[PDB]
């Protein structure tokens, strides 16, 4: 299979800091977008989104117009109290009404600790 | 262990508004999406709106789109949902459902009627 | 837009599926002994299966497809079945399949 693995079920960052919350893509295939979501449902918003807009507080941990990238990983910055919440790392495929949800990762608690 | 009473259940007027309350335990209500379904009794399950963690974020139902208000109170572990202008149609048991409907309140049942 | 089977029927000990499609969302079962009683989720988001819920049950999303799948059917999973689906920003059900055990 492709299988996206988030191998960090928690992450404890200081508020006002930057949280890395990592995903790992084992294989490239089927093609398609990584979009990262916090909660799971109808309500899940839409964190970040290769395909998509521009997000101004989520750089990119790698250069995804490389070629063999595998990784997926993203940096929310200005992390405030009300960031916390479980992100799910989720591979969609290619579609014609267009991109359908593949596979998720198994999520990853986010908790901000206001400390200096 | 998951807990959830709807309340806010009984006879409305037509064309009248009132709201439904779910409360939440067991599980970690901020860093967990909501939805609200209903069921017209002895017939099916209709969504009717979603709501995400945070609040700011609403989805609804054609069925209600427009005269519907989801809302959610983290600090008091709350859902609600204010319905406007009741419809013969309306007239339903009203569930709360976490997440990805995983798990489901015993609902309430709201019967539009003078 | 989620069609499913209207009922289906099955014997005991037999290993009944139901399906479901119509979304290109993630699928949920929701079991419901009689009308009226509160809904009892089956498996949610494909194929998880809470850990209440006995292990005969199992689910599948395969295209934009859902299977559910009772593997040794019994007298008490006589029921009705709702498929539900959803993508961020919106959810929908099936119509129910009622499913009796012959016998």
């Known amino acids: 299979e492709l299988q996206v693995i988030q191998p960090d079920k928690s992450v404890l960052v200081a508020a006002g800091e930057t949280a890395t919350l990592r995903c790992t893509a084992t294989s490239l295939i089927p093609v398609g977008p990584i979009q990262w979501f916090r909660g799971a449902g109808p309500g899940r918003e839409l964190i970040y989104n290769q395909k998509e807009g521009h997000f101004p507080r989520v750089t990119t941990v790698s250069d995804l117009t490389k070629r063999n990238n595998m990784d997926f990983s993203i940096r929310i910055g200005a992390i405030t109290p009300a960031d916390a919440g479980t992100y799910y790392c989720v591979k969609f495929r290619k579609g014609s009404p267009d991109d359908v949800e593949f596979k998720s990762g198994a999520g990853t608690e986010l908790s901000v600790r206001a400390k200096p | 262990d998951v807990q959830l009473v709807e309340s806010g259940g009984g006879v409305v007027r037509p064309g009248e508004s009132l709201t439904l309350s779910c409360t939440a335990s067991?599980?970690?209500?901020?860093?967990?999406?909501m939805n609200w379904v209903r069921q017209a009794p002895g017939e099916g399950l209709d969504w009717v709106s979603s709501?995400?963690?945070?609040?700011?974020?609403?989805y609804y139902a054609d069925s209600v789109k427009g005269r519907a208000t989801i809302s959610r109170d983290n600090s008091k572990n709350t859902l609600y949902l204010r319905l406007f202008s009741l419809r013969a149609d309306d007239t339903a048991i009203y569930y709360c459902?976490?997440?990805?409907?995983?798990?489901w309140g015993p609902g309430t049942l709201v019967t539009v009627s003078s | 837009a989620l069609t499913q089977p209207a009922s289906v029927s099955a014997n005991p000990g037999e290993t009944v599926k139901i399906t479901c499609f119509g979304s290109?969302?993630?699928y949920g079962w929701f079991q419901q002994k009689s009308p009226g009683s509160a809904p009892v989720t089956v498996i949610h988001y494909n194929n998880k299966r809470p850990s209440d819920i006995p292990s005969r049950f199992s689910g599948s999303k395969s295209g934009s497809t859902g299977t559910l799948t009772i593997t040794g059917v019994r007298a008490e999973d006589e029921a009705v079945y709702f498929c539900?689906?959803?993508?961020?920003?919106?959810?929908?059900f099936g119509a129910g399949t009622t499913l009796t055990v012959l016998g």
């Open positions: 067991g599980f970690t209500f901020t860093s967990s999406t």
């Open positions: 539900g689906a959803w993508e961020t920003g919106s959810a929908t």
């Open positions: 290109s969302g993630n």
């Open positions: 709501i995400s963690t945070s609040g700011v974020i609403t």
């Open positions: 459902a976490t997440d990805t409907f995983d798990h």
